[PDB]
Amino acid sequence: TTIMAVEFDGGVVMGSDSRVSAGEAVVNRVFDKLSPLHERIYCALSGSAADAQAVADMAAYQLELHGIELEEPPLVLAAANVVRNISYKYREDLSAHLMVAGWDQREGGQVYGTLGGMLTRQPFAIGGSGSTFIYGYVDAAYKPGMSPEECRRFTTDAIALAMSRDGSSGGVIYLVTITAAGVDHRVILGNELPKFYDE
Amino acid sequence: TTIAGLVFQDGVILGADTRATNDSVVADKSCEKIHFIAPKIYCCGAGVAADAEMTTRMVASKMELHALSTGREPRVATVTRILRQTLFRYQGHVGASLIVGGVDLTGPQLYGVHPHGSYSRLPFTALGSGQDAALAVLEDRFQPNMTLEAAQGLLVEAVTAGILGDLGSGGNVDACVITKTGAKLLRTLSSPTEPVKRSGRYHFVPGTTAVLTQTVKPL
Amino acid sequence: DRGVNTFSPEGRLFQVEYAIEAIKLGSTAIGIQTSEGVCLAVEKRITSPLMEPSSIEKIVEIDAHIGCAMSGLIADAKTLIDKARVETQNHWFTYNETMTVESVTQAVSNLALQFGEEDADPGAMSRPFGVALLFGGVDEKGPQLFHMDPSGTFVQCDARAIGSASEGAQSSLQEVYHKSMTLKEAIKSSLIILKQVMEEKLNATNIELATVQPGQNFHMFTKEELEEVIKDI
Amino acid sequence: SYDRAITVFSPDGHLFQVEYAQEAVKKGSTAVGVRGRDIVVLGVEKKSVAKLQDERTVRKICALDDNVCMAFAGLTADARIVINRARVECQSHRLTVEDPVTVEYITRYIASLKQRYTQSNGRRPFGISALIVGFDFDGTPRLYQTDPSGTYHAWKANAIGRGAKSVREFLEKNYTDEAIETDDLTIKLVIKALLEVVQSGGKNIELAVMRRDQSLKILNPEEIEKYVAEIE
Amino acid sequence: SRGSSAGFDRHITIFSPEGRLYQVEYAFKAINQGGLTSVAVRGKDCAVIVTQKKVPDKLLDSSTVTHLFKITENIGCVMTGMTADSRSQVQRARYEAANWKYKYGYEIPVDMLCKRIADISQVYTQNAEMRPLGCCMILIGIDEEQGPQVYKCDPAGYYCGFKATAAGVKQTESTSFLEKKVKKKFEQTVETAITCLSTVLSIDFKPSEIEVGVVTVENPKFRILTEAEIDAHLVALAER
Amino acid sequence: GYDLSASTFSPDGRVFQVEYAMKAVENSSTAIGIRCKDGVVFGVEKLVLSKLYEEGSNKRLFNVDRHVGMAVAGLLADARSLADIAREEASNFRSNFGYNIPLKHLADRVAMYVHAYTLYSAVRPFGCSFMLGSYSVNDGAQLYMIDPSGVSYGYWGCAIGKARQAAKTEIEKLQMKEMTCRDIVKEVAKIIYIVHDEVKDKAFELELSWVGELTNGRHEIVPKDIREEAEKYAKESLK
Amino acid sequence: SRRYDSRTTIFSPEGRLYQVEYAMEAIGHAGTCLGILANDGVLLAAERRNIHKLLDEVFFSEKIYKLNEDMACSVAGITSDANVLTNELRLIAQRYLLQYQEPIPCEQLVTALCDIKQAYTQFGGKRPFGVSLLYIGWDKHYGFQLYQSDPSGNYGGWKATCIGNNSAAAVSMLKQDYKEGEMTLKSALALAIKVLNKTMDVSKLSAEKVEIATLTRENGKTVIRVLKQKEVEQLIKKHE
Amino acid sequence: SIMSYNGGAVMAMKGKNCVAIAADRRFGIQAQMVTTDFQKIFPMGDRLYIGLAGLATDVQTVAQRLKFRLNLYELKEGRQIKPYTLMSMVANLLYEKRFGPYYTEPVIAGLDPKTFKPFICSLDLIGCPMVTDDFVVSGTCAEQMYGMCESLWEPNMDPDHLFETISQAMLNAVDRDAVSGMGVIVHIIEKDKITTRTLKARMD
Amino acid sequence: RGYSFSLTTFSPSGKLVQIEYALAAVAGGAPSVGIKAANGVVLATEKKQKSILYDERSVHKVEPITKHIGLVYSGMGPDYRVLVHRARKLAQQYYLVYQEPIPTAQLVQRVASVMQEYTQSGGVRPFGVSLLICGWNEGRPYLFQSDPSGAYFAWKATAMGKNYVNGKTFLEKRYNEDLELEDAIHTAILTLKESFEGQMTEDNIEVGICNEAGFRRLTPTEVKDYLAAI
């Protein structure tokens, strides 16, 4: 599991690998780790896939009631405060991690980190078990002010690196670019993952 | 217990063995596993047999009641949702690794919902102890848009590989073909084993059993 | 019909006014406070010779230094008496000392305006206590006699008459009482007033009498002692 | 839950529900007791002879323990409730003290109970007056009367139920130490009492008997009628 | 009978000697307190709801005096009668939609929404302590199966399907005219609604005095027609 | 009559308890607000009932949250209770959603709260209206006026209390869409000095507040110098 | 609110629970029901009000319910309340059989229920059950038994009694015609058809206007049996 | 093992219109034979017996609660319980204690009330109802009974051959177990009569 | 919190006046009719349909409770929706607990109980509906009528709502025990047709049938066919 988000000017880009493994044999070699919380707020799951799913659904419910009751698209800060509350209130019972990202009229693109029940906006907020192998790459290749294609090819590279080394991560790489226009869901097949030094 | 699924052009098809062990001993030889949920939504059962039975039966009731309520077909999204909230509330103690499948107005949908609540839509899957062989052959021969006959023989290859290749999964394979038209429970599709006869008659004439006390009650 | 918590056009709860009228039907009791201690005598008002005279006990013990006379709905005052008993004994357990009279009459006085018909988490009290108590006792502050009524107001009094003929009798209390009075004089005086007020002819059976002195615990005068004191009439 | 205040004061200080419950007792089947030297007798008037009637299940003189029995009068169902609660509480007393209950304990208990239902939310007062008779562990005889108001008393011999005025006048006139010198003078005292109020004295308001350290003894209807002719 | 009354039948929801519920019938007398009249009609393609809009004070922020209430992304709503009760049923209906979406995984159909809300007004018309919410909520939504949907739930708990309707003071003349037009047959639909309502009121409305909602098969999302577009349909009415 | 509880429609369908409670608001002292280009202003005809009271007794301009003001009227204790309910509302919203609550949603929640007491015989209506003001860079100035019925309307200019009509006829004299706070304060002052029936119920105080650009959205009572220049000018406009 | 309380748990100015006595009026209007206690068995005979129409008679009897292995009960008056009471008695007796592993005697069962009816008659303010019950059941302590309970919670053992319509004439005829300890089961049948013949004023008695079920002992087991119609015609004809 | 604390095994078996239920009779604490007439086969109707096994207290408690719910059913209904209904009832009852489970592994044997079709079923200690067609077993010595039954059972045996088969099944099957035996009880359930038979088992 | 005392009190005559009044309300309801054939049961109820604006196919009075049970009522609609949802709840509990289709006599016992609970609970009025529950199982037809008072009667054929007396007298002369299902439906539709007042159509009268195949509503086409020949 290696989910990743990036902040650029018009919006964000949430890459994520597509494997969920049970121990040493995989259960699902294609699994979209990006479940929408609203029209333009995706949460990248990780950890206990069941727990992450329940949190994504409850958070989508509250964000939808709060969404309609104000009659205006709920700000991402709202979403990461509800997922932050539900991840903090149950922290002894959920091994979940939800890099909730999205767009909103009042602030533009955002990527909030919510490991362990905390809330911290960040430029690029990578997570997942494979995320411990790409800190080097992302630190060496991240330059603020990235155009969208730079963000997409960037996170594709990073998750590619994590996929080659990590056993908890493999398969295809999903990418979505959230902006004022809408969501642009894309998929990276295993024949298209950019090849790195293989030996 | 080796249950599998599959999705083809027209609809889905669920497999299932017919054995159920008691810790080292094959208790049953013809236990059913493709249970009933809605008129076209079937739910296979792996794992703790009692908990798959009870869970899928409760959710069966909620979908029947709901089905009379909305005056409509039940959508498999509903079944999977109630199943995974019921499974999630208990925190994985209810080890009932369902694989629910059906055919909605949206099209054939083969969900798979594990004991903690983690569901995942996907085109082919196989739960249970023989998920290794079933995942093997399904991985090796699956294709998008298969013929229903190729689906039937393929799934039978899968659950068969579970039957021969595993200990706690045997007897006959059961496959149920679901389509937009309706459900057909093709009970006992294939029967690999044949050992049903014998050659030693073991009869004792009445009187060989030493009876101490007796009584008869007319009804 | 109206509720129990209704204020009249004059500003008093109905149930406390009608209850303080209900106390007016009870048998007259009187006690007096002196620097030697405090006495308590109450008319039993026996109804028939078939009754046991020792049955009617309108002067009961609350602890080793607090004697609680009453008048009115004698049934209601059981919850008050048991309340006070549990109170002073819990006070002794926790704080390892005897409980002051003001503390007791204040505590037991908290269950006088605690009545209603909508809060009622239990089936709590549905009307004010139809009891007028007169907690008597001695503490480190010495002899004190605290009146109490259904309205929950506990007031320190030098000597007070409560019950049916408590008005006239109270006039006798302001008539006779003086601070330097000796306790046997208190007993004699109070018995004189009761003899003034009682309908039946007085005797040592249809009354009781108790006192609590600085070194003496609470004590109820038996038949012979009561007779010995009534020899003066 | 029902939390209305049923029992509330009225514009004289009276608790009208209590006066009304005592009205219900004043129509109850007349009962009487007396306290003798070593015996305690209770008599319950006739109640409902009704030749098809069953005797055993329509008596008013139930057992509360080995040493505590009770009459009553009025709403018989209510008295069944109070009897039940008193029984359970007697046994809980033997659980927490190991000593059988004094008559004062159980009587003051039931008086507390009746007092609570006179003074709680949505509960009417009991319509029962209970003449609980019993023997303290020292063996002294005990007569305690408890009315719906909750006030209880020791008694030499007191009568409850309808016409308790005339019968109480009777025990006021005829209760003497010559009257309770012996058993049979005691029981002929009780039945001699109710006979003013029991139609066709002889075999109507049969009674009950308890001897010192002896469980409740009951008629013996033929033996009631012996005394019947003996007094008539 | 014939208006007979006994005891507390005229005070709470208990059956009078006839069998009527005077509190519910009085509630229907209470929808006429708002002094309004709303209309919803549905053609094959979309369901349109048009209402009055009385902004008399001139200090009223006209953006907030509205009887249209987006219930979901696909479910319209037009109240009538007492106001605050209408607000409350809007909150409760929104909670129902979010809860159906959470538990059951899809958009609540209009039939199950208005059915549910009717179930929650019946409880008022049966228990004795709270009164019936005096406000007849109309819904409009496009189910993928049956198409344009308009359901009317009232304080009596009833509800039903409609090819047209109206709620408020002039429900009688509105329904009369809609009889007179449905018997004579829907594309414009909106022209029908504004023609009917303006007829029974006889006002010749201005584009600011009313509001319009539409949910089309081509556009499921409930939506509000601004005073400019309502100006378009109105001027399209005057020029024939 | 037929009017013994809110859960009883009359034969004509009017919950007489709500109407009565409105007659309770209308006996109180008039308060007014005016939403304008850059915020909201509140005045309070706070009649002082005796010279004993402290300057500042019985304030009717609260602070339900730092970006929302509240002017009340009528039975004042009930106003305080709405203060506690609203404050709990904004606090709950900041703990749930992590930012200042939009005032519109706050008058939704509170309006449902007041409305919760006009359905039962077990409780009575709040006999008090009130106004809410707020300013924010995201939504500008907003003014909502809950009444005893629970209905929430947004106003450009509002008035609640006993002289509501005269205060309305005074408020319509303004182009409040084109004024700023520091000029609105004077005109609200003139309004309160005009609508106040002086010879009956003399001796009131003027208690003002705004929230907007100049206060950075932080609702705060008016500076004493501004309140005194305001009273000076308004009284001069009386003349 | 206090205007609405009927105060069903209060005494009158003369000490008479108005709701219990009004209930006694209701059961007073119910169909008569009487059973007789004998030596060889017990029989119940109840006037049916399912008389005669397009009813189906899907059940085995009308007013006779089976309570355990060894008992039977007859209700009179409010049918629904009789249902609730029957279900409650079944629950009681089966809890006794759980907690003691033997059948429950009749006296204990009747007391357990009558404590319930008394409980409603005392507090809670609910209306009391307007349902009188006659019981029949065997127990190894005291033999065949007949228990009459009424809405006030009071009950008594009887040897033969009648509750409901014309109960006075019925108990009168029993007083004139019951031979204590000498009535046989068949003598009980004949007498019961006597009383029901004289009391039921609808006029010529049929097999359709009553039902009778008898309980006896057979081979260490109790038998609860209803009389088929042929036996009823036989016993009425014999009565002629 | 909590199950083998008392030992004991019960089986049923299906014939030609008669299902025969057996049981051992040794109530014993772990190694101490305590009683030889402990009842494990509790009737639930005219032709319906529910043989339980396992820990003794769950034997008697499940039997008594089941008889509770069954008398409530038959009274509230107008009918004896059909065997499939009884199976779903007992499965519900064991399953209500899903996390505190009764250590009982019942087998239900009987006939349809109306059509008189043979019926059996075994259950696990949490209620997985497993209807079968040839037989069932339950208890500490299940395996020996699977051997003897699986070798001795035949399709369509009339009552008498049935008693022979289940007889030798219980005898051989319990003699190779320590914690069971001490006699054997057998019930034949025909259409018209019900024969109870105890067997001569090793008393050691 | 809500009123806790019963609102239905024994009148001094002892007849529960609220249930008299509720029965008067059902007596004013739209007419309904049920008849039991030899192989099934018919249910046909009159649509008191106002203006043609109504989407008649939007809601139905004859709702199935399971695959083999129906319901028709007479009186207050929303109350009926309450009893329908309650019945579906009960039959589903029974199906979970015993794994069998609930016998109709049982379901009518429970739903009769629920109709009784509100004649006695705190501050609720009795229902205002008289159900007709038709059911099939054990190869046998069932038809029960529950009232506001909670009691249920087993019927051959019955009528309720407006003019139910003339309806029942109409059935006494026209019901025969050997009536097959279709001729039963003819008899019921004639029964309503006696006092319809409005020229029945396939839109304004509903028809339900319960037979061995289960319960269901007859589509207005088929009901139109039966509305032929009359």
mmCIF file of C-alpha atoms in Angstrom, chain F residues 41-239:
data_model
loop_
_atom_site.group_PDB
_atom_site.id
_atom_site.type_symbol
_atom_site.label_atom_id
_atom_site.label_comp_id
_atom_site.label_asym_id
_atom_site.label_seq_id
_atom_site.Cartn_x
_atom_site.Cartn_y
_atom_site.Cartn_z
ATOM 1 C CA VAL F 41 -25.044 47.448 13.350
ATOM 2 C CA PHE F 42 -27.296 47.005 16.373
ATOM 3 C CA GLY F 43 -29.013 49.496 18.609
ATOM 4 C CA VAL F 44 -30.957 48.678 21.766
ATOM 5 C CA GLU F 45 -33.643 50.861 23.307
ATOM 6 C CA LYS F 46 -32.691 49.374 26.667
ATOM 7 C CA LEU F 47 -35.129 51.028 29.034
ATOM 8 C CA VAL F 48 -33.497 51.331 32.439
ATOM 9 C CA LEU F 49 -36.197 50.628 35.017
ATOM 10 C CA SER F 50 -34.541 52.453 37.915
ATOM 11 C CA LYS F 51 -31.544 54.619 38.699
ATOM 12 C CA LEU F 52 -30.141 51.834 40.900
ATOM 13 C CA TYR F 53 -29.039 49.604 38.034
ATOM 14 C CA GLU F 54 -25.442 49.596 36.862
ATOM 15 C CA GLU F 55 -24.571 51.135 33.528
ATOM 16 C CA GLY F 56 -24.508 47.889 31.604
ATOM 17 C CA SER F 57 -27.243 45.973 33.397
ATOM 18 C CA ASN F 58 -29.495 43.757 31.292
ATOM 19 C CA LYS F 59 -27.381 43.871 28.148
ATOM 20 C CA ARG F 60 -29.267 42.708 25.071
ATOM 21 C CA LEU F 61 -26.288 42.472 22.708
ATOM 22 C CA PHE F 62 -24.564 39.164 23.305
ATOM 23 C CA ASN F 63 -21.736 37.268 21.671
ATOM 24 C CA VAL F 64 -22.862 33.852 20.451
ATOM 25 C CA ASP F 65 -19.471 33.551 18.736
ATOM 26 C CA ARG F 66 -16.670 35.879 17.765
ATOM 27 C CA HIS F 67 -17.998 36.247 14.212
ATOM 28 C CA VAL F 68 -21.708 36.483 15.133
ATOM 29 C CA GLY F 69 -23.585 39.028 17.218
ATOM 30 C CA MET F 70 -27.030 38.719 18.749
ATOM 31 C CA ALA F 71 -29.622 41.364 19.586
ATOM 32 C CA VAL F 72 -32.682 40.120 21.463
ATOM 33 C CA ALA F 73 -35.925 41.450 22.854
ATOM 34 C CA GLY F 74 -38.912 40.426 24.901
ATOM 35 C CA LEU F 75 -38.721 38.150 27.911
ATOM 36 C CA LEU F 76 -35.024 38.433 28.477
ATOM 37 C CA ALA F 77 -34.200 35.229 30.377
ATOM 38 C CA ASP F 78 -35.372 33.281 27.341
ATOM 39 C CA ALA F 79 -32.984 35.406 25.305
ATOM 40 C CA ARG F 80 -30.163 34.282 27.584
ATOM 41 C CA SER F 81 -31.204 30.670 27.088
ATOM 42 C CA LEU F 82 -30.999 31.172 23.327
ATOM 43 C CA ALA F 83 -27.550 32.572 24.035
ATOM 44 C CA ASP F 84 -26.504 29.317 25.679
ATOM 45 C CA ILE F 85 -28.082 27.196 22.936
ATOM 46 C CA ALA F 86 -26.493 29.213 20.141
ATOM 47 C CA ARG F 87 -23.088 29.274 21.842
ATOM 48 C CA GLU F 88 -23.273 25.505 22.173
ATOM 49 C CA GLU F 89 -24.170 25.474 18.488
ATOM 50 C CA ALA F 90 -21.142 27.389 17.232
ATOM 51 C CA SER F 91 -18.879 25.505 19.628
ATOM 52 C CA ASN F 92 -20.206 22.194 18.329
ATOM 53 C CA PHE F 93 -19.610 23.379 14.788
ATOM 54 C CA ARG F 94 -16.033 24.424 15.445
ATOM 55 C CA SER F 95 -15.293 21.105 17.116
ATOM 56 C CA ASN F 96 -16.944 19.134 14.321
ATOM 57 C CA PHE F 97 -15.906 21.088 11.254
ATOM 58 C CA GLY F 98 -12.940 23.186 12.319
ATOM 59 C CA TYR F 99 -13.911 26.686 11.247
ATOM 60 C CA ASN F 100 -16.306 29.509 12.002
ATOM 61 C CA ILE F 101 -19.918 28.490 11.494
ATOM 62 C CA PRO F 102 -21.709 30.222 8.614
ATOM 63 C CA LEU F 103 -24.381 32.358 10.221
ATOM 64 C CA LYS F 104 -27.002 30.996 7.847
ATOM 65 C CA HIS F 105 -26.536 27.500 9.224
ATOM 66 C CA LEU F 106 -26.555 28.952 12.740
ATOM 67 C CA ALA F 107 -29.965 30.524 12.256
ATOM 68 C CA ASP F 108 -31.087 27.261 10.731
ATOM 69 C CA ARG F 109 -30.012 25.357 13.839
ATOM 70 C CA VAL F 110 -31.303 27.888 16.354
ATOM 71 C CA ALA F 111 -34.505 28.388 14.367
ATOM 72 C CA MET F 112 -35.124 24.666 14.606
ATOM 73 C CA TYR F 113 -34.382 24.978 18.317
ATOM 74 C CA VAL F 114 -37.020 27.644 18.958
ATOM 75 C CA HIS F 115 -39.404 25.779 16.682
ATOM 76 C CA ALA F 116 -38.883 22.682 18.804
ATOM 77 C CA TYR F 117 -40.999 24.324 21.523
ATOM 78 C CA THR F 118 -44.125 25.171 19.524
ATOM 79 C CA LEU F 119 -45.353 21.594 19.073
ATOM 80 C CA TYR F 120 -45.885 20.248 22.578
ATOM 81 C CA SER F 121 -48.062 20.917 25.571
ATOM 82 C CA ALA F 122 -45.063 19.900 27.666
ATOM 83 C CA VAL F 123 -43.258 23.198 26.951
ATOM 84 C CA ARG F 124 -44.121 26.707 25.835
ATOM 85 C CA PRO F 125 -42.695 28.907 23.084
ATOM 86 C CA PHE F 126 -39.743 31.154 23.650
ATOM 87 C CA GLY F 127 -41.359 34.530 24.047
ATOM 88 C CA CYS F 128 -38.480 36.384 22.439
ATOM 89 C CA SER F 129 -37.305 37.437 19.002
ATOM 90 C CA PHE F 130 -33.725 38.265 18.146
ATOM 91 C CA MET F 131 -31.338 39.323 15.411
ATOM 92 C CA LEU F 132 -28.002 37.814 14.433
ATOM 93 C CA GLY F 133 -25.229 39.732 12.727
ATOM 94 C CA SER F 134 -22.065 38.464 11.125
ATOM 95 C CA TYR F 135 -19.354 39.565 8.739
ATOM 96 C CA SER F 136 -16.851 37.483 6.851
ATOM 97 C CA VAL F 137 -14.694 37.884 3.781
ATOM 98 C CA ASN F 138 -16.384 34.771 2.402
ATOM 99 C CA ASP F 139 -20.021 35.866 2.749
ATOM 100 C CA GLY F 140 -20.154 39.486 3.742
ATOM 101 C CA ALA F 141 -22.715 40.817 6.177
ATOM 102 C CA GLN F 142 -25.856 38.890 7.090
ATOM 103 C CA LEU F 143 -28.791 39.590 9.392
ATOM 104 C CA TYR F 144 -31.383 36.995 10.388
ATOM 105 C CA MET F 145 -34.374 37.591 12.616
ATOM 106 C CA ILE F 146 -35.854 34.637 14.474
ATOM 107 C CA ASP F 147 -39.258 35.225 16.035
ATOM 108 C CA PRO F 148 -41.218 33.072 18.536
ATOM 109 C CA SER F 149 -42.522 30.937 15.665
ATOM 110 C CA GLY F 150 -38.995 29.876 14.732
ATOM 111 C CA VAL F 151 -39.064 31.213 11.169
ATOM 112 C CA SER F 152 -35.772 32.662 9.913
ATOM 113 C CA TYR F 153 -35.756 35.543 7.429
ATOM 114 C CA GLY F 154 -32.813 37.536 6.161
ATOM 115 C CA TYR F 155 -33.265 41.290 6.379
ATOM 116 C CA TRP F 156 -31.570 44.386 5.061
ATOM 117 C CA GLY F 157 -33.159 46.249 7.957
ATOM 118 C CA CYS F 158 -35.008 44.844 10.926
ATOM 119 C CA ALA F 159 -36.906 45.924 14.012
ATOM 120 C CA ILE F 160 -38.303 43.899 16.901
ATOM 121 C CA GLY F 161 -40.127 44.985 20.014
ATOM 122 C CA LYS F 162 -42.949 47.366 20.748
ATOM 123 C CA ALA F 163 -42.359 50.132 18.181
ATOM 124 C CA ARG F 164 -41.573 47.723 15.336
ATOM 125 C CA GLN F 165 -43.777 49.538 12.850
ATOM 126 C CA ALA F 166 -42.367 53.025 13.404
ATOM 127 C CA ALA F 167 -38.859 51.568 13.384
ATOM 128 C CA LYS F 168 -39.643 49.961 10.030
ATOM 129 C CA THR F 169 -40.940 53.211 8.548
ATOM 130 C CA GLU F 170 -37.717 54.755 9.805
ATOM 131 C CA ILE F 171 -35.537 52.006 8.333
ATOM 132 C CA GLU F 172 -37.095 52.289 4.879
ATOM 133 C CA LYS F 173 -35.759 55.853 4.713
ATOM 134 C CA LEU F 174 -32.239 54.510 4.199
ATOM 135 C CA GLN F 175 -30.070 53.402 1.299
ATOM 136 C CA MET F 176 -28.398 50.915 3.607
ATOM 137 C CA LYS F 177 -27.000 48.969 0.653
ATOM 138 C CA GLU F 178 -24.708 51.962 0.057
ATOM 139 C CA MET F 179 -23.556 52.946 3.551
ATOM 140 C CA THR F 180 -20.616 51.931 5.701
ATOM 141 C CA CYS F 181 -20.639 51.040 9.398
ATOM 142 C CA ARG F 182 -19.240 54.320 10.719
ATOM 143 C CA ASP F 183 -22.124 56.168 9.079
ATOM 144 C CA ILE F 184 -24.714 53.498 9.858
ATOM 145 C CA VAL F 185 -24.104 53.932 13.584
ATOM 146 C CA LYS F 186 -25.432 57.490 13.554
ATOM 147 C CA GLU F 187 -28.565 56.545 11.661
ATOM 148 C CA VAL F 188 -29.358 53.638 13.980
ATOM 149 C CA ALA F 189 -28.949 56.161 16.786
ATOM 150 C CA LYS F 190 -31.440 58.551 15.165
ATOM 151 C CA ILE F 191 -33.791 55.617 14.735
ATOM 152 C CA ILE F 192 -33.743 54.715 18.417
ATOM 153 C CA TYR F 193 -34.178 58.319 19.539
ATOM 154 C CA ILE F 194 -37.096 58.735 17.121
ATOM 155 C CA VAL F 195 -39.031 55.524 17.754
ATOM 156 C CA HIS F 196 -38.685 55.806 21.528
ATOM 157 C CA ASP F 197 -41.891 57.196 22.973
ATOM 158 C CA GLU F 198 -40.177 59.512 25.418
ATOM 159 C CA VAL F 199 -42.958 60.794 27.695
ATOM 160 C CA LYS F 200 -44.017 57.189 28.354
ATOM 161 C CA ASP F 201 -41.265 54.913 29.663
ATOM 162 C CA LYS F 202 -38.500 57.525 29.911
ATOM 163 C CA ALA F 203 -34.852 56.898 30.800
ATOM 164 C CA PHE F 204 -33.415 54.289 28.449
ATOM 165 C CA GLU F 205 -29.837 53.595 27.432
ATOM 166 C CA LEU F 206 -28.343 53.253 23.977
ATOM 167 C CA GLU F 207 -26.253 50.104 23.585
ATOM 168 C CA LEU F 208 -24.714 49.636 20.152
ATOM 169 C CA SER F 209 -22.550 47.086 18.392
ATOM 170 C CA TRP F 210 -21.274 46.205 14.956
ATOM 171 C CA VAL F 211 -19.182 43.552 13.278
ATOM 172 C CA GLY F 212 -17.434 44.014 9.970
ATOM 173 C CA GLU F 213 -14.341 45.245 8.190
ATOM 174 C CA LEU F 214 -13.175 47.749 10.803
ATOM 175 C CA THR F 215 -13.425 45.077 13.518
ATOM 176 C CA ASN F 216 -11.863 42.363 11.321
ATOM 177 C CA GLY F 217 -15.054 40.357 11.576
ATOM 178 C CA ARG F 218 -14.755 40.234 15.365
ATOM 179 C CA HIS F 219 -18.108 41.235 16.836
ATOM 180 C CA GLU F 220 -17.457 43.812 19.528
ATOM 181 C CA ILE F 221 -19.478 46.490 21.257
ATOM 182 C CA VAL F 222 -19.146 50.014 19.900
ATOM 183 C CA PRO F 223 -16.363 52.268 21.239
ATOM 184 C CA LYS F 224 -17.700 54.662 23.844
ATOM 185 C CA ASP F 225 -16.477 57.672 21.880
ATOM 186 C CA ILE F 226 -18.330 56.464 18.792
ATOM 187 C CA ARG F 227 -21.447 55.744 20.836
ATOM 188 C CA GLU F 228 -21.334 59.215 22.371
ATOM 189 C CA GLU F 229 -20.712 61.068 19.121
ATOM 190 C CA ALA F 230 -23.550 58.965 17.725
ATOM 191 C CA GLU F 231 -25.981 59.898 20.500
ATOM 192 C CA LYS F 232 -24.846 63.500 20.140
ATOM 193 C CA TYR F 233 -25.630 63.609 16.424
ATOM 194 C CA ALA F 234 -28.883 61.653 16.693
ATOM 195 C CA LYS F 235 -30.161 63.854 19.509
ATOM 196 C CA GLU F 236 -29.143 66.854 17.422
ATOM 197 C CA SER F 237 -31.235 65.419 14.585
ATOM 198 C CA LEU F 238 -34.186 65.199 16.958
ATOM 199 C CA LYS F 239 -34.103 68.938 17.834
#
